[PDB]
Structures are given as C-alpha cells and as structure tokens.
Design a protein around this ligand. Structure first.
Ligand SMILES: [Cu+2]
Length: 98
C-alpha cells in the first residue's frame, strides 16, 4: 500500500517516523517536509542494489514547507535513508518492501 514518512516530527524534533514502513512490492512512498531543515534523504544501498536505491535516493534538500518526494518500492529489499547533513547525529529510517 501507499506509505508516508515525515522527515521530522510534528513538534520540534528531528526524527524519522515511521522509522519503519512496510508496503507491497510495486507501490510508491511519499515524504513530507518538516522542521530542522534542511532535511535531505539519501538511500544508502543497505541490502538493496545501488542503481535501485539510487532512483530511490534523493540527493536534494528541503527548505520550503510543502515540498515532498517520491520513491518506488518495486524491487523487494531494504532501503535505508538517512539525513545527509545529519548522517551521523541520530536521524535515519528503514524501509521494507514485500
Ligand atoms: Cu535531518
């Protein structure tokens, strides 16, 4: 099914919820802008292919509150996307396609 993850929290904390999402194999996923920007989204091939996690990865950023991203969960694997600017602070997410 369609999944939704926010690059933060509706309060004032940089977190990734749901930290883990499970959808079908072929569906997509939409993200949402939050606080503690910018909030990048890079899917480091962690169990899945590169090129795959590539299109799934987002080497961009987030500044405007309203912009969202999309990711194809076709290939069944495990994609791990974390904060580029905070790739070593305590902000990461896990994906699971079935
Ligand atoms: Cu962040």
């Amino acid at each position: 099914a369609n999944a939704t993850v926010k690059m933060g929290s509706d309060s004032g904390a940089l977190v990734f919820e749901p930290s883990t999402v499970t959808i079908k194999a072929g569906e997509e996923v939409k993200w949402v802008n939050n606080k503690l920007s910018p909030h990048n989204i890079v899917f480091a091939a962690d169990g899945v292919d590169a090129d795959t996690a590539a299109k799934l990865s987002h080497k961009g950023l987030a500044f405007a509150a309203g912009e969202s991203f999309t990711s194809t969960f076709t290939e069944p694997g495990t994609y791990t996307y974390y904060c580029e600017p905070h790739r070593g602070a305590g902000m990461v997410g896990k994906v699971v396609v079935d």
